[PDB]
Design an enzyme around this catalytic site. Structure first.
Site, short mmCIF file in Angstrom:
data_model
loop_
_atom_site.label_atom_id
_atom_site.label_comp_id
_atom_site.label_asym_id
_atom_site.label_seq_id
_atom_site.Cartn_x
_atom_site.Cartn_y
_atom_site.Cartn_z
N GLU A 12 19.56 61.89 87.32
CA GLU A 12 20.18 60.81 86.50
C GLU A 12 18.90 60.27 85.47
OE1 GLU A 12 23.08 61.11 89.65
OE2 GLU A 12 23.05 60.77 87.49
N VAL A 18 21.12 64.45 83.24
CA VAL A 18 20.34 65.25 82.80
C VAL A 18 20.80 66.82 83.49
CG1 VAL A 18 17.97 66.18 82.48
CG2 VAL A 18 18.42 63.72 82.40
N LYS A 33 20.55 66.78 77.89
CA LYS A 33 20.34 65.26 78.13
C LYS A 33 21.69 64.47 77.18
CE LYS A 33 15.74 64.93 79.48
NZ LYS A 33 14.45 64.11 80.00
N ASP A 123 8.01 53.86 77.68
CA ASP A 123 8.40 54.03 78.87
C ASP A 123 8.07 54.88 79.84
OD1 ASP A 123 10.03 52.92 81.12
OD2 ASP A 123 11.66 54.40 80.65
N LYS A 125 6.51 57.02 82.73
CA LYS A 125 6.39 56.72 84.22
C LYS A 125 6.31 58.13 84.82
CE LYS A 125 10.70 55.38 83.49
NZ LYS A 125 12.18 55.31 83.50
N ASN A 128 9.04 60.99 83.94
CA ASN A 128 8.96 61.76 82.88
C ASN A 128 7.77 62.44 82.48
OD1 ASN A 128 7.55 59.47 81.76
ND2 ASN A 128 9.47 58.46 81.23
N1 LIG Z 1 12.75 68.04 80.00
C1 LIG Z 1 13.23 67.93 81.21
N2 LIG Z 1 13.05 68.80 82.18
C2 LIG Z 1 13.39 68.78 83.38
C3 LIG Z 1 13.56 67.45 83.74
C4 LIG Z 1 13.76 66.41 82.89
C5 LIG Z 1 13.89 65.18 83.38
C6 LIG Z 1 15.07 64.96 84.17
C7 LIG Z 1 15.12 63.56 84.57
CL1 LIG Z 1 16.40 63.07 85.97
S1 LIG Z 1 14.03 62.48 83.83
C8 LIG Z 1 13.54 63.66 83.14
CL2 LIG Z 1 12.18 63.67 82.23
N3 LIG Z 1 13.57 66.70 81.57
#
Ligand SMILES: Nc1nccc(-c2cc(Cl)sc2Cl)n1
EC number: 2.7.11.22
Length: 294
Positions: A12, A18, A33, A123, A125, A128
């Site tokens: 999430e 995602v 996303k 943001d 963290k 990310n």
């Molecule tokens: N680009 C990408 N690749 C794999 C995972 C993610 C991701 C998945 C979330 Cl849940 S926050 C976030 Cl950053 N983004």
């Protein structure tokens, strides 16, 4: 999107679900996303499109922006794991200092690049900050905050963490500077070292007071103009500053020196990403291969 095969739900995100997906045409695996409601403002569209050009080795590449049926989908480069999971999986021994330095070194390069183009994350963290098996780490969702404002709760009602939020934000500053990202990165740096979050606030005031208890309640001496900020209250308790040797052991003098500069109260005094890269802490930086078991 008909062009993608949702192979799995990754998690999430701040703006929506995602998914890990595969492009049928190219066969490449991507991070899909979904963003969020009325028709998507042209301003958000233009902002996001500008991000397609912000390319750097330490920034998760924005591959495409798909707007159809009045719905927005962002297509990003895919990485197998985030720093949050990696830290949890390395809790027993903690991430080796050489790898911590390498990650901080790469993260700062990513910030320096985005900041030179006047783009902020706002943001940052562990969630990310994505890593791969080759020893690289990249910043994800850079610039989305400006396009889409960071909510208090996500679509799943999950509380967006305040643990890495800079003090000027907590105090009501309406204009954010690149300094907010250095603050967040400083908190993450401390967390990798101690294996515990630096300021795990569970409310805005709890967050602010946790910062105050460690770094001392800010005043006009260390932060000119602070008492005139929107949410500042003369009634804030007055706490004394703790020594960093106590806050982040066993970080050496170079690391503590750098962390202190990344955690300065006054946004203007806080070290920039570019200046941080020249800090003596990185004199012996290397690029270790991490132990990732996918
Ligand atoms: N680009 C990408 N690749 C794999 C995972 C993610 C991701 C998945 C979330 Cl849940 S926050 C976030 Cl950053 N983004």
């Amino acid at each position: 999107m008909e062009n993608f095969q949702k192979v799995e739900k990754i998690g999430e995100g701040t703006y929506g679900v995602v998914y890990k997906a595969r492009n049928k045409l190219t066969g490449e695996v991507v991070a899909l996303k979904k963003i969020r409601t009325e028709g998507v403002p042209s301003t958000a569209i233009r902002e996001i499109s500008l991000l397609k050009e912000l390319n750097h080795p330490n920034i998760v590449k924005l591959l495409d922006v798909i707007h159809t049926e009045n719905k927005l989908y962002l297509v990003f480069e895919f990485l197998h794991q985030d720093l949050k999971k990696f830290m949890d999986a390395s809790a027993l021994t903690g991430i080796p200092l050489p790898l911590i330095k390498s990650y901080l070194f790469q993260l700062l390069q990513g910030l320096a690049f985005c900041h030179s183009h006047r783009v902020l994350h706002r943001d940052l963290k562990p969630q990310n900050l994505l890593i791969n098996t080759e020893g690289a780490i990249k910043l994800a969702d850079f610039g989305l905050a400006r396009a889409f404002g960071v909510p208090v709760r996500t679509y799943t009602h999950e509380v967006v963490t305040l643990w890495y939020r800079a003090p000027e934000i907590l105090l009501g500053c309406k204009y954010y500077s690149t300094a907010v990202d250095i603050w967040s990165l400083g908190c993450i740096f401390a967390e990798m070292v101690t294996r515990r979050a630096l300021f795990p606030g569970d409310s805005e005031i709890d967050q602010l007071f946790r910062i105050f208890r460690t770094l001392g309640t800010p005043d006009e001496v260390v932060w000119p103009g602070v008492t005139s900020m929107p949410d500042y209250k003369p009634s804030f308790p007055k706490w004394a500053r703790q020594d960093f040797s106590k806050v982040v052991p066993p970080l050496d003098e170079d690391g503590r020196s750098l962390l202190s500069q990344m955690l300065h109260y006054d946004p203007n005094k806080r070290i920039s990403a570019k200046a941080a890269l020249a800090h003596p802490f990185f004199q012996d930086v290397t690029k270790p291969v991490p132990h990732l078991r996918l």
